[PDB]
Design a protein around this ligand. Structure first.
Ligand code: NA
Ligand code: NA
Ligand code: NA
Ligand SMILES: [Zn+2]
Ligand SMILES: [Zn+2]
Ligand SMILES: [Zn+2]
Ligand SMILES: [Zn+2]
Lengths: 189, 189
DNA sequence: CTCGACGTAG
DNA sequence: TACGTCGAGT
């Protein structure tokens, strides 16, 4: 019935694995499967009766439920925050569920740190040079600026362009991943 | 009358500065201004008769002309590539004009390098781990993947997630700016 | 709720 | 033409 490479959810609790955790079948033994539960990267032996096959292509945009890209638990659409709109007018939700976004968002910029950054804000319509990408721009006209902050401490960093800020987040604001980017680029340079 | 911090365009060719180049007024005397032309970062003394005031807030989205974020020349809207759609259904163009995009895009992935990459493409619906961000995903379900390539050589790099690929571009695929990101983050550790 | 920006997909 | 994704602004 189940085949290698098929996707399943846990029907019930399986040790550390909560219900609705998505796994992929990695081996089959009679009516038991070795399942890689993707969120925790845990390979477990599971009886077929404890698993429910799912169709990954009937999840996400256009469907009732969506698989989170961090925890890889199948959740209702409302477990994800609306974030954008496509050309066809449909709403797009973040790929990470509200629970996983708590850890990505971390500590908010404090009120005193915000006021402090606001007192040195580049004026709208001024000529700005971003301290990261070094691009010159006209504030609010040829680039939009943001209050960047450290989400471990809640304290301010600098005024930077939105492009750079949304780049930092792709790499988790973490020098570990930036160093990985450098060695990746250098490898093919 | 022209005031410091006002914006102007060059009416005519001014040495290295082409017409319609945007500049900011940095000093004024009775007949001329010191103008910083933003694209080339060139500060010149220009007679008032060779400058025209420009309302920077009547450029870009919703208007017939737009100021490029690299060259900072005022161009027709059609000099910029349509790239996205907002929630109100209006089209958004790239901030960089078609001419400036040539340098950003560089050399395309060659046919032969593309075929090499396609030979080792992760299957749709497989479990993938991005070599940069180290995030696990289900291909085409919880993350979309791309052919990354070096745009100086046209040679392939690796299959990576779209999030990482679009992060590389924010930092110009250039270790210089990635090292700047690292120093910036460490400063506010 | 909304946003622009990136290199991709096609 | 179009796409999702990021930390933001609103
Ligand atoms: Na930030
Ligand atoms: Na306006
Ligand atoms: Na790339
Ligand atoms: Zn989650
Ligand atoms: Zn920047
Ligand atoms: Zn340009
Ligand atoms: Zn990645």
């Amino acid at each position: 019935m189940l085949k290698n490479d098929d996707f399943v959810i846990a029907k019930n609790q399986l040790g550390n694995i909560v219900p609705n955790s998505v796994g992929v079948i990695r081996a089959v033994n009679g009516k038991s499967a070795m399942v890689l539960f993707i969120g925790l990267n845990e390979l477990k032996r599971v009886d077929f009766s404890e698993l429910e096959a799912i169709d990954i292509y009937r999840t996400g945009k256009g469907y009732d439920k969506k698989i989170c890209n961090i925890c890889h638990i199948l959740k209702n659409t409302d477990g994800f925050e609306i974030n954008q709109t496509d050309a066809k007018g449909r709403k797009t939700t973040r790929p990470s569920c509200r629970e996983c976004r708590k850890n990505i968002d971390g500590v908010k910029l404090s009120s005193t740190e915000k006021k402090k950054m606001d007192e040195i804000a580049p004026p709208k319509g001024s000529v700005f040079t971003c301290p990261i990408c070094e691009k010159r721009s006209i504030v609010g006209v040829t680039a939009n600026l943001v209050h960047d902050h450290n989400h471990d401490t809640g304290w301010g960093r600098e005024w930077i362009c939105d492009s750079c800020n949304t780049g930092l987040g792709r790499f988790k604001d973490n020098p570990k991943f930036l160093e990985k980017v450098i060695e990746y680029l250098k490898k093919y340079e």
